């Protein structure tokens, strides 16, 4: 699980059906600051964020442990929609 | 025209969460919100068809964990005569 | 920009009863109410996200009391569009 | 899962029986320009993705929550079509 | 599972509720020095470990071989406090 | 005024591990304990409120592996009048 | 920023002699007692982590001999926060 | 699953025997020339490839997934022997 | 699946009780000449594995499918103590 | 080119009701039919992807009001080669 | 001479998702269709051996989840005189 | 490099239409046959690997009509050390 | 002297199979076959002791897919008279 | 003082392996070995504490793969009196 | 620097012939032999890992024809501590 701002979303018409309804998000790891510093990655919301937000997008065997994520074909997922950041007792990041 | 999605929801909170997750979801204009009173509202959203499909379905099940919905629809292209004289937001 | 929180009550004086309870609880700024008809009305409270997060369940607990409590949520940060359509207060 | 743009085929002929008559295809991850910029990675078809298609795939253990894969040795697979990617609130790629 | 070095703590309010009251912390991997030498990574507490701490974090589907990460959806977790590092015989760190 | 998180064991070793799992879970202020007899401690937080509120979830279960838990509260917005009139820190003197 | 050892017993002759015997399992240092009222006291002692978890679990053992013991508990390195707001013999 | 070329064979005397009469390969992905560009990866055959063939090793929870290397300890092993690689319509290998 | 030669040992005293007994080592990743080119990674053993020898170190969810490790949390574990390297037909490496 | 959407029925009638309701379904181009020969008609259209998906599996609703419908399937980008050998209206 | 791969199914909607797939999989010339009346099509491809078998299996498969699907057949060296007398291109 | 066929029969006609098939199946290159006494002879042809795998397990077919089939095996490229030590004619 | 290593299979396939994986599996010199008649076939197998020990056991396990295999075995230091009276290639 | 670890097993391959297998756990000493008789054979190391209770707990588990183990223990101070009256390696006047 | 090989019977007699059928099975030297005391001895070889393999395998079957046979154990690469403390003749 790593840190990360949601950057775009992803529209597929012609997908495999157990997803539909899925929210696809483009997300790009930040460091631990707000400033994204990464390449893109697409994963699906779980939690409801949007653009401009920072989340923590969980990554394969356990990216489906949640409903709406089951059985269903998912490596990515979001699981939280961060708040503050600390580091060595000084805030590097706030919302 | 613009593509057409609409989601009905008896509550209010339940139109919201319903709008709100559509718009997260895809490239999509949110139009505005229709009252007919009685407690039913109804969002409105218009895009592209693809966008628009793909906000609907999150809608649907984004205002199901609150609950009610009572109707989920998507129009493609509306007819002229329908822009011009409904509030869908495209209307001359 | 602030979060948002939303309680919708089959009758007035439950949605007072959970605003009084939700602005006493935290630091949030109520911002007024959505009647949608049919009886149901609807508080609307925004602010910081955790405060509202612990704003509605305040809420919601003290206005069961009253009576019937539709639906309650909590949306951490509205899409730009959202805002700009729907009446909470954070209108341009 | 990937962004990805389909670059071309590939063909076994001795290979694991369970997987034949699966689909293999070569895509390599592109930024969200449909601008190819990474490593060419294999994986298997489930959509009837052809070549030149912006894809996505996903990986590993949960690459195989599918139908056409579901206990066979595979860990990455095609699950849909993309059509549009939005960044910022403007489109950089469409069909 | 990696030499990890605890720097900071990461705060979701709106979370997958099956992972609340889990504790995540933010972790860079290090040499054998306690020198971090990494990108910032995310992973849930099981040890009750604090910032300043040399740590090992297992990831992947092994990271939930572990009570209060069984079901639940994470990738990362702590599972060690370090107390020394030998290479060839001289100890690189101590506690 | 500053959030507040509280937790009260019977014991005491529970106290100092809920005590120190509130501080290595988020940015808080350990702030001093209480003593009411009878063995009941009590463990006094203070901050922002997203973070009290995450760092007591996670005493909680923190001291639950130790056992007993008497009580475990969070308030957001104290009105001035506790805060003045209580020894939970923050207050002006 | 030493470990931590903990051990609180329902009586003063538990905490002594499990003292003595955590003392003498590793080279681990008595900081003092706490007693919370109503009875209870705590031993505290401090040193390498893994002294103080051989310290313990050698003195738990030694303990349960004379009487109940509440709890044991080990923090390999408590925060810097605590040490400074506890009496736990490591106050600045 | 990538594209390999095998270099050489590891040989241990020292194993767990559930892996025992396992043939243990070493590989390089290539790219589509049979031209190999990566670090040496080892990978256990279950296909019959030998040196100087183009394979692909799938790797990790989903290389287990093939009638032998079942409840084996084993992230990567080989599935396919390739006869050519195809890309926009020209072939970039051959056989 | 990766050869790799030991260079130290890690020692955790509170760590998830589970694996309690377990040897934790530190491996570097070797070319097949013996000169280690790579991260160091902490890793289990299950082979009795020492200071100076050429390992292989399966990792992730399928580093659990041994005893001593079984619904343990590890995500990397040795199988192998390697004797000798082919590379083309040239021994590379020997014991 | 576009995407691709066919509808087969054992009927001349039901295609035609079938091509009738896909137009006025979505942004589609209708560019002819295949007759198979021994009863069986095909229709077939072109036009963006999730306008074919939407605008078929809304027509093919209206052929099974009228009779029996053999295949359905949508094809969003066929091969080049295809398009060159087969007579779907994307011919050089 | 090239390879032979043929595909007949009752439909049209069904050779097309088989003969598109079979193209999408390998290095194969899609070479036409043969409609022997009665609703009957025949898809035809050619190309090198190992390909043909690979696209052939893939388009059984993705014509299968349409259904029907009457016969999938793939012959390696086609005699000399069959190319000469039968439309399957390469004459 | 050249892969190989391979049938061995228990009877020598059974391998001799095995052997026709085969180069009548696909282009394959047929070397010739070993005799390993005891009745058992052995057809081997070799070429590229699909044509082969097609080639056998249509000769496996095609003597099974006479009698049995003792065994059929595909390989996909002999290790360079087999062809110099073995008579299955790619020796220098 | 070199290690032995010898694989003796009823058909003839069931040898290259096994004759051929044994060499891919390790630096080992595949240094002939002798036939006992009656169908017997015997694979010889020589090197390094490892590689050998590992060669042999990927052919008895690669052979069984064919079926049969009579016997499998492995000598690390055969004796000077062997090597020098018995046709197993090392011989002076 | 240094630490003390002790495997004491009936056979002698259960030390070496329990010996060998302390030594590659954790940086400890191995000291030497006290033969009892009987077949009742003592591995003993010394070292860092958290390194021999690392490496005690790897042999007791390693050495029960061959069997017996009669006991294992672990001493994180040992009186000085021990270590200049028994023969566990720090002794004095070394 | 090389492996280790060895096997512990309850008496003289097991030990000598499972020394000699090791020596006879691969290349390896004998050291020697440990006497634990209680009837209990110890035979030790040492040389490559693969071979000790075969040795001690070959023993432990070789042995129990005479007697009983405790234990038998290979370690491919002992700490350099331990050949510095045991008599396993690789000794400085």
């Known amino acids: ?95 | 025209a613009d593509a057409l999605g609409m989601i009905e929801v008896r509550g209010f909170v339940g139109m919201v969460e319903a709008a709100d997750a559509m718009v997260k979801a895809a490239k999509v204009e949110l139009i505005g919100y229709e009252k007919t009173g009685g407690g039913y509202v109804t969002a409105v959203v218009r895009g592209d068809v693809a966008a628009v499909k793909a906000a609907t379905e999150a809608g649907q099940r984004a205002a199901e964990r609150v609950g009610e919905v009572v109707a989920v629809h998507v129009i493609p292209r509306p007819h002229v005569n329908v822009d011009a004289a409904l509030p869908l937001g495209r209307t001359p």
């Open chain 1, 1 to 95: 699980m790593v840190l990360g701002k949601v950057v775009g979303t992803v529209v597929a018409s012609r997908k495999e059906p157990r997803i539909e309804g899925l929210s696809l998000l483009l997300v790009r790891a930040c460091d631990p600051d707000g400033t994204p510093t990464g390449g893109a990655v697409v994963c699906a919301d779980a939690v409801g964020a949007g653009v401009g937000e920072v989340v923590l997008y969980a990554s394969g065997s356990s990216a489906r442990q949640t409903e709406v994520t089951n059985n269903r074909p998912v490596d990515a997922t979001i699981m939280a929609i961060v708040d503050l950041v600390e580091m060595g007792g000084d805030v590097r990041f706030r919302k």
